[PDB]
Design a protein around this nucleic acid. Structure first.
Lengths: 762, 49, 43
RNA sequence: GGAACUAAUUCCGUAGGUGAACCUGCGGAAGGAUCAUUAAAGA
């Protein structure tokens, strides 16, 4: 299968991603690595991932308005500078006490770092040296803000401590001008308003205006009381003279507030999910604001009663409860995750997410109707809801909701749907034992339930448990067709198959079984997993069934054979769930890890082996045609490709015999020796090494060495790996044959002696 | 000592001027190698047989 | 350098240096070679 | 099943026992092999 791995762009350690003034380019960190994905309309690509150290974690990372360089801080007290153009770390240095806050100005020349201890050092972006070091206030530094003009003789740096103290350090003056402990809590966000007034975000709730000057005079112009934590704030030019400060809060409600009055012109959202926006990266000139949410998602909001997000990009899905395909197109896969919302992701680089949050419960189960549209959600919260699956437009609804029962909805399964697209009923179950079938309560099994699945005829249904039993009850009435006998220690999944007509069972031990309606008993028994099976997905061709497993590996087998066909080992630490594309077999694998992957069945690879097996049988008959009649150049090559030594040696027998009137063999054969590969000069000389052993195959070896020496550059022959050890065996046999041939010349002058004593007689 | 050197700088016209002047001289002194084998092969044939 | 049996299954190398592939053999030559390696292994 | 081809430790009292060549819980006994260091209110 052509499995494609999927990874999360924003994950692990909390940090603020750095984006450039232009929409394109973005930086996110997952564990040790940092992933940079350029942002362009219609194209998403990841430039590169920095390996760094897997053991180390990333406290924070920063990108300049123009993305020339990427700056990140490791867990160890050192600073690593990365150059975007060459993808190489130009400089690295120790920042002593680690500083989470890094501030970059529009110009990339100056970068500010805040230590854990509260000591702040300013480092030039271009050269890895510290222009100056400030002892600063004796507290952790919450944030710093730089002020600059493309060309100016005045530069102002503002630093915010954990306590409500703001020091406006002046770089040219090298003095701390001002102290403003108006704030009673650490200042999380500082924004320097254009001329001079200083706006400081207050962690406690107070957002405080200030007057800044080179001279001592400074005063508090205004104080704004907002009912949210000020995570970050900024000044927006839009709205002219009445600039509306941009405020980010713990509740995640973005607020634009009049300057002249404390009233809020417009609030972009309130979100049902209980998340806080860690920090906001705003282009400002482009009037685009990026909000990093506490549910690990990024929302793009334009700046002009409720702010409307232009698009939503989800950096990482922490956990996928289950994988179920939804929609007519089938491009987007509905995601069941540990959150109180439903996320719809498109199927093919950052991926945008459609998100629906019908209930507060993290989704604990999910299901979609086979003919296209509907989606149904099972959650920890007792409420169970049905979702409107339109494929046309961006419209989505959740019209039906079900009161039911006082425990979490373990799983929602709908046997059937009517031809108008309305579900007939919902069977659903719990952490307790109270198992219910609501149309639009039964009990089964003393402990928590695990899975619910259905047959295309609505006749039969089955459900599974931790106390080891599977129950098959009538769908129409309130009747019990039977009970399955038991599995070894707890049944994680139950799956019906259309062609076979079987009920498969996954377990909490490493065994899978196949169960029958007719006898209520085990048809087949499987083994050779490590941990626990978790989910079993039906296969499109109804033969090659797919089981997942809580040891990170997925495996494929046929019920009729009973034997393992294939194993897939491409995921990291776990597996939880599995999806199959209905129309064409594509196995889609879902885990505790934030990686994801799409696999596919590939008869096509057999046709590669068919053409390879055909090619030999094709070329042997040419070879035996060449071995009939000559054309020994082609008889050499097809021997050299398919490695028949005795048929190759017969060519070099005949090639010497035909070469009886520097050219050592046939001339076109000599050109064929010149084009021999490095793997072929090993194999030819190795066969030539064998031929040098006995004196009958002797000279046929020696003429083949003479070509390779006469028709190659000999600097290759030392480069070639393992070729020297072949030369160790060739040489002392040649010296042995050298005396042996020369001694036949020494005996040969008896013929010279038989002339001289004879010609004297004459 | 220098067979590494004169091999890599083979077919220089200055070195091979000397080496052809070597081989034009060195060919004449095969006449003992054609003399020893007669001196060997007879004396082995005479004393044994 | 002793001549040795080749690492690939598709070839057979004899003790004298006459290498034989498994694919250029005839079935009657396949017979004698298995019969020859029978009596040396048996001995 | 048929017929081809290719490939190649001991003991005592007491109580109980269904994996009891006997064991186990509670309390006793030795009739069982003591090396080493040792003033530190050395106020």
């Amino acid at each position: 299968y052509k499995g494609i791995s999927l990874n999360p762009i924003y994950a692990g350690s909390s940090a603020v991603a750095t984006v450039s003034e232009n929409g394109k380019i973005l930086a996110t960190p997952v564990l040790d690595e940092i992933n940079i994905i350029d942002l362009t309309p219609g194209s998403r690509k990841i430039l590169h991932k920095i390996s760094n150290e897997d053991e180390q974690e990333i406290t924070a990372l920063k990108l300049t308005p123009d993305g020339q360089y990427l700056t990140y801080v490791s867990q160890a007290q050192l600073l690593k500078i990365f150059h975007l153009k060459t993808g190489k770390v130009v400089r690295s240095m120790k920042i002593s006490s680690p500083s989470y806050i890094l501030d970059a100005d529009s110009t990339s020349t100056l970068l500010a770092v805040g230590g854990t201890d509260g000591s702040i050092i300013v480092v030039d972006i271009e050269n890895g040296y510290i222009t100056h070091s400030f002892k600063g206030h004796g507290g952790t530094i919450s944030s710093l803000k730089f002020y600059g003009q493309l060309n100016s003789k005045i530069w102002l740096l503002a630093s915010g401590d954990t306590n409500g103290m703001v020091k406006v350090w002046d770089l040219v003056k090298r003095k701390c001008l001002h102290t403003l402990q108006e704030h009673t809590s650490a200042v999380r966000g500082l924004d320097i308003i254009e001329v001079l007034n200083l706006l400081s975000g207050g962690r406690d709730d107070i957002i405080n205006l200030w007057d800044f000057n080179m001279k001592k005079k400074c005063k508090l112009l205004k104080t704004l009381p907002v009912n949210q934590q000020v995570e970050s704030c900024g000044f927006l030019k839009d709205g002219d003279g009445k600039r509306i400060i941009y405020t980010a809060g713990g509740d995640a409600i973005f607020q634009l507030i009049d300057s002249e009055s404390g009233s809020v012109l417009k609030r972009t959202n309130k979100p049902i999910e209980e998340l806080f926006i860690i920090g906001v990266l705003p282009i400002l000139s482009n009037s685009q604001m990026f909000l990093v949410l506490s549910d690990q998602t990024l929302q793009l909001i334009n700046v002009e009663d409720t702010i409307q997000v232009t698009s939503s990009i989800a950096g990482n899905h922490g956990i996928i409860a289950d994988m179920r395909y939804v929609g007519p197109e089938l491009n987007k896969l509905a995601l069941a995750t540990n959150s109180p919302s439903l996320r719809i992701i498109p199927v093919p680089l950052p991926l945008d997410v459609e998100i629906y949050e019908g209930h507060e419960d993290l989704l604990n189960s999910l299901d979609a109707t086979e003919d296209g549209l509907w989606i149904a959600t099972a959650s920890k919260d007792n409420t169970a809801i049905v979702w409107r699956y339109n494929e046309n437009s961006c419209k989505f609804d959740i019209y039906a909701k079900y009161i039911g029962h006082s425990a979490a909805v373990t799983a929602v399964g709908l046997p059937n749907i009517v031809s108008k697209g309305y579900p007939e009923f919902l069977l659903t179950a719990s952490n307790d034992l109270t198992i219910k079938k609501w149309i639009i309560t039964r009990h089964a099994h003393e402990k928590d339930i695990n899975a619910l699945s259905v047959s295309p005829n609505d006749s039969i249904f089955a459900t599974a448990s931790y106390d080891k039993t599977c129950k098959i009850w009538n769908l129409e009435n309130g009747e019990l067709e039977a009970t399955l006998a038991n599995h070894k220690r707890g049944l994680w999944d139950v799956s019906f198959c259309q062609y076979d007509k079987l009920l498969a069972t996954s377990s909490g031990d490493k065994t899978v079984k196949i169960w029958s309606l007719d006898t209520f008993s085990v048809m087949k028994t499987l083994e050779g997993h490590t941990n626990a099976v978790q989910r079993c997905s039906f296969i499109n061709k109804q033969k090659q069934l797919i089981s997942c497993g809580a040891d990170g590996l997925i495996k494929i087998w046929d019920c009729s054979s009973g034997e393992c066909l294939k194993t897939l080992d491409g995921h990291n630490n776990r597996l939880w769930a599995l999806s199959t594309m209905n129309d064409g077999d594509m196995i889609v694998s879902a885990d505790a890890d934030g990686v994801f992957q799409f696999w596919k069945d590939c008869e096509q690879e057999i046709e590669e082996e068919q053409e390879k097996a055909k090619l030999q049988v094709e070329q042997e008959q040419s070879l035996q045609n060449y071995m009939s009649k000559g054309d020994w150049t082609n008889a050499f090559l097809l021997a050299m490709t398919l490695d028949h030594p005795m048929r190759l040696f017969n060519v070099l027998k005949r090639a010497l015999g035909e070469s009886r009137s520097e050219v050592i063999f046939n001339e076109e054969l000599d050109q064929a020796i010149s084009i021999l590969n490095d793997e072929q000069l090993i194999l030819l000389m190795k066969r030539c090494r064998d031929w040098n052993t006995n004196a009958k195959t002797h000279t046929i070896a020696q003429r083949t060495i003479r070509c390779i020496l006469m028709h190659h550059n000999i600097a290759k022959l030392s480069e070639i790996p393992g070729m020297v050890k072949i030369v160790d065996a060739i040489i002392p046999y040649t010296q042995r044959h050298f005396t042996r041939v020369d001694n036949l010349v020494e005996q040969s002058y008896i013929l010279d002696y038989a002339l001289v004593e004879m010609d004297k007689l004459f | 000592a220098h067979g590494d050197v004169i091999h890599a700088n083979n077919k220089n016209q200055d070195i091979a001027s000397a080496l052809q002047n070597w081989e034009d001289v060195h060919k004449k002194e095969d006449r003992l190698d054609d003399l020893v084998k007669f001196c060997m092969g007879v004396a082995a044939f005479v004393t044994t047989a | 350098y002793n001549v040795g049996k080749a690492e690939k299954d598709g070839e057979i190398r004899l003790k004298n240096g006459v290498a034989m592939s498994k694919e250029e053999l005839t079935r009657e030559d396949k017979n004698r070679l298995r019969r020859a390696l029978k009596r040396k292994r048996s001995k």
